[PDB]
Amino acid sequence: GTSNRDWWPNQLDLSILHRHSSLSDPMGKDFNYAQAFEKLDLAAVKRDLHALMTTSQDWWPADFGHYGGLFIRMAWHSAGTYRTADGRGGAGEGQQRFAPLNSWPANANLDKARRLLWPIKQKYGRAISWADLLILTGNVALESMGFKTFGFAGGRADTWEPEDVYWGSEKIWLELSGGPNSRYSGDRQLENPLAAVQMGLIYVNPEGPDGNPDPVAAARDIRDTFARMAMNDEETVALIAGGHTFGKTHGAGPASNVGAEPEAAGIEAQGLGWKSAYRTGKGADAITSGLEVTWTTTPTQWSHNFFENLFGYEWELTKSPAGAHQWVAKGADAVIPDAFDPSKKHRPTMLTTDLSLRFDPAYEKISRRFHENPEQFADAFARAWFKLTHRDMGPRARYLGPEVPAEVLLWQDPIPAVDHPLIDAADAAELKAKVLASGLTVSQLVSTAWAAASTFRGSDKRGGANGARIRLAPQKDWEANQPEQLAAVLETLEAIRTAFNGAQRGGKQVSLADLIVLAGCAGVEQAAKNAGHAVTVPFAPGRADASQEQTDVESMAVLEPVADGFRNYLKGKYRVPAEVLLVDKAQLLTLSAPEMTVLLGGLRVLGANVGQSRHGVFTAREQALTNDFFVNLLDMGTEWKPTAADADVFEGRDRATGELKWTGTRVDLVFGSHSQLRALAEVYGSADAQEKFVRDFVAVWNKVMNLDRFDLA
Amino acid sequence: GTSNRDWWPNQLDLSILHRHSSLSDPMGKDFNYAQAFEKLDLAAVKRDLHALMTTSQDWWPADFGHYGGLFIRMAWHSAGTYRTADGRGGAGEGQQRFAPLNSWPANANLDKARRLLWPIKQKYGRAISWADLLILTGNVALESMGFKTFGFAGGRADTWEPEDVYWGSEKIWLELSGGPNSRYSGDRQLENPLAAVQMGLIYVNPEGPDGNPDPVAAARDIRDTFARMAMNDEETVALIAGGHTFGKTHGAGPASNVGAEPEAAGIEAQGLGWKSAYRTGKGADAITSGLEVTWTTTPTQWSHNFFENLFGYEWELTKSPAGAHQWVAKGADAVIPDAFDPSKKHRPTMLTTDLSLRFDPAYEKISRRFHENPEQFADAFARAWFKLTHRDMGPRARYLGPEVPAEVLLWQDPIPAVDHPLIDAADAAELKAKVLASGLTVSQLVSTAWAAASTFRGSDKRGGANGARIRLAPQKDWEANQPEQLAAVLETLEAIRTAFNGAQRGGKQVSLADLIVLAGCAGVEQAAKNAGHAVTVPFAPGRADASQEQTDVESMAVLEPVADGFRNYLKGKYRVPAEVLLVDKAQLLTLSAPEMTVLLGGLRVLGANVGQSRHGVFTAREQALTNDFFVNLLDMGTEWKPTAADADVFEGRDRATGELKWTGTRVDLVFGSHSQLRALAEVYGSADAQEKFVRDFVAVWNKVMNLDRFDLA
């Protein structure tokens, strides 16, 4: 059945903005997962999960009688898809249970893992999400095998359809680099936003780069991909060695025995996949990755045996029973237990990527320190495991339950507590009047608040105006933020703040974060008055100001907008067309298509463009809040053509005279081209729509200003 | 970016159920188009449209100084995509403005026509939908040129995204038949549900079948396709001859001069397409279809000159300037005006398909009658044009405005007015108890109401329980409806009805349509009580009973369910898998995925399966409303395998003993296989879900009962 995507495969896709509707959600519109979770008997769940660890099912028998390694890998993979570039992936939406991730080759046989959890899921129902359950199970596996975790927070609400994520352009699972859709160019440069080396892998290839078994070169891929997942060297070594303290790999026969992944399997498979024709197809005969490695002498118990083995033997290249490259300890005795036969023992073995921890010189130093100081290793792995499994949860205010660690961690972009009375409505009116009396313009006020608030992304719930980080490095220096203009606005706002705060009694004060937002609100109010309209913009105080020392500058870099269509900004020339980048940004902001449309048309007339560019400024009353953008864009009296100098800039001329009336970018003109966007533009550019435009703009502005306000949830 | 559809291109697509969310709609949740339209000054709109007809724009100059022909074609094409097989297509949602229809080759240059109407649309805003305006414009065109229309109803609310419609499997526009995705098999049998001969055409090819200029053979295609759009021979001849009384075709140079369709065009084209490099690219130089025919001596005025020409000349095969086959009048004088040069005249010309109206023997009889009796022609055309343009509007209760025809037409499936007081809540409780005391079972009551209500389809708003057509031919004899069982239930309910109506005073009575629905309600209440749960199912009276004489039996044939997964029914063996047909039925019913899931699992346990099949009846308390379907389907203690006898029937055995527990079809087991459906099944199969399951089942039951109740809007 031929679809619009088949006919016009390069047209923009707006359905990514209308996922996660109330239509596909089985829960009622008022369901609130946090409230459900807070009444869950978490201790009861943990007891059931402990019991499960050794309750082997015949359809997927437990290695060593204990499912803890399988479950650790399950949780690691749930979290392991995360990319710092866009915040997409990670454990926080339980997406491992949907396509494509439920069928990625690196997630083979995790379908078995999730099915073993169904009885617990069923028993507790809506009070524990899948997303929370996958991580809790990994924690219980660790605790059951003798490792004390750093903590756990609930609050990951389940989702109900697959997320629209760019995982790459390859059309073959696991394709090696340098193909027609290669994710690598130049000197092994991985394309942003990807954080895995091959399609369907989590980070790297366990046999080495493109399957070449060189631990030193593997190390380079490990370092690059783990950095793209927010992990530094210490955290990376801790996580790999910690993980591989447990369990084993599965490669008992040739891979050709393994059948269809879950999304390809027959209906009778009931949601499972990778059925194997090799012997019994399971247990001792299991095939997952094709490798056949067991790292430690006690795979079901926390030990220091990983680094004893890594450093205590020399390693020889060998092949598993499926033909994959792996390593075996030279001259060693058979000390590693077998998973099923108490009469068999094995020599120590390692993956290429485990050997990276010894043969990359930076990792070796860390590995050696962990080998000599196992308490340091345990602590580092506990912290890293917490970070891994919570990286996408957002502000600490979202963290639920009795096991939430009290320690504030720098990676959480922490916001200080508020310990003083907040400004009330009379105070807000007094501060808005002061801001308008200062001489700051509508353009300056709107631009500044936009800059502050629009760093939010719902993928990992980082960013937003809380914290006033726009005043800190590195946000204050970002090109999109107009550093010189920004500094002049912030100086004026800090002077208003100081004067207000110095007049108060009783401990009342206003944060700069709140004042930035409030000042933006006053700009929008002033713009509405400029257009003849009496409008009140909602404001909620309670933001606090974070310090520079609470703001990791390197972690903040990935929130820099290199493309922000809402300010007609593109930092460089990219291969993805700018209107696709606009839709991607709207998706991070949580905006629907109508919201994206009204927001952009209003920002253009308020003067929010970077550098005061006239591109898309289709009005003769800039700084007045009108629907002019739409009325003019849709005027058939104007003809548009790309310029000679630049095919991405367009000139709009009077059709009868040839006279130039406007210029615009692709982001501007897509609203007049795309057949669904133009239908939305037409609503706002109709003669009956001015009041609707204003009230919808105010709503979407307020939505953006509050995106990170989980303190008010 | 590789997507799930790329990896698993045969997986079922649930997004067709989650279109039209409040996310994509720019109007507020409380917007009601009928309320807006009812205050529109329709007379004023029509005056503006009359003026537009002769106000040429230079970017697409008006033929003969009058846009009326263009607008009639535009309205015909808006309505012309309709297919009776599924009710999809038609003018009722304004879909011509979205992909793919906005870029179909048969819709070339209607982009121009729609752009000409933006100033009117913009002036009247939300009070007139695009969908209504396209039709209204065609009627104003006709009236402006001296044709008296049969009337007009508003009420087509605008939609905001493309509908998911199967338009064929070809991958090339206009592909001729007999390719690898041919829509024809056997002796020119067009595949259901299609109603056009080539991808991107409305009905037929104007040169003749696959381009062969044989009017007799073309007639066959005309007849078959028009019948698939609900038009008989008289209506067909009236429409084609009526339409081709006006305007002209456009084929002034070779087609290779015409560029990209709108969805493919550059951003600068601002939603227009087919830009032509031939001479001026417009007006006298226009190329649309590649044919160059003008039918009448007065292309801007109603006449009977089409038939005077068709019958008054003999016709010679010729080629247009673009190379297309067309016909010209032998020996004729130059009597047809030129569209732009008042000093040029032309010979009469015809399409192959016009000549069909004379050379097909059945058409010739009708055409000759219309030629001798142009008043008969005018009346048939007016009636046919109203039917064409209103065919998908639904019940007459949806028809809005001051020009609705008072005549009730048989094709409307009319419902008599109610002229008596309705039963109240106490009466409804008395009737439910009488029904339960009769001895009718939960299964009989649920199955009968299901059968009556589930003929609704939201594509053209036909069907539903209003009318009590289930008691009439042909519904009473449809296999899915279990004719002997149904007859028994209807007899019992008619005796209840007689006894209740005969005891009343004051004219109060209950219709059989209402009592069928109410009885189903009593069944669902009784099932809930069987499960230990007291619930009240909502009921709204006011349906009426239609007569056999008010029921077109042949038109009702297309509403027969040949596949109804909700009753585990498949009338024959089809190429599309049964799970895909389920989702298609759910889309017709207007159900979301959650709604489809609850509804099916509840129907299975209430005994709604046709023939009392055990397939999917995963309960030991049939006729009790419980979640047992979900809990049993999802039990990993059961293993499923296709049977030897039938690969589409599955046996569920205990995994440890081999004992047979259940049997199921693909429709049952898809809820345990598909990863999004299984996620829904898990919510209703959880230990906390009994209350939710009952509540949600009652809500979707009541939704289905009320689908055709536009009298309550």
Ligand code: HEM
């Ligand atoms: C360079 C990064 C890594 C690579 C290439 C890698 C590779 C693999 C492979 C190939 C398997 C075997 C799959 C099978 O055949 O069953 C595996 C198993 C496992 N991995 Fe990793 N791993 C990485 C990092 C991690 C990390 C960060 C964790 C967790 C903290 C982890 C925990 C596990 C555990 C517990 C198993 C055993 C599974 C079982 O017992 O069933 N791994 N790893």
Ligand code: HEM
């Ligand atoms: C067998 C069915 C039909 C065929 C094959 C057909 C074919 C065509 C073609 C090839 C054109 C020229 C497109 C262009 O080059 O501009 C056209 C024009 C037109 N058709 Fe039809 N048509 C059919 C039925 C109808 C019907 C049912 C109506 C309306 C009741 C209609 C009304 C018109 C009008 C008004 C025009 C002239 C447009 C103008 O002046 O711009 N047609 N037809």
Ligand SMILES: NNC(=O)c1ccncc1
């Ligand atoms: N822990 N990571 C894995 O299990 C894995 C990585 C690459 N191919 C298969 C599995």
Ligand SMILES: NNC(=O)c1ccncc1
């Ligand atoms: N693909 N996932 C995200 O982009 C996301 C999820 C939730 N809200 C904003 C963005």
Ligand SMILES: NNC(=O)c1ccncc1
């Ligand atoms: N009235 N129908 C048309 O305009 C048409 C039919 C087939 N190809 C192009 C245009």
Ligand SMILES: [Cl-]
């Ligand atoms: Cl995601």
Ligand SMILES: [Cl-]
């Ligand atoms: Cl449709």
Ligand code: NA
């Ligand atoms: Na994420």
Ligand code: NA
């Ligand atoms: Na329809």
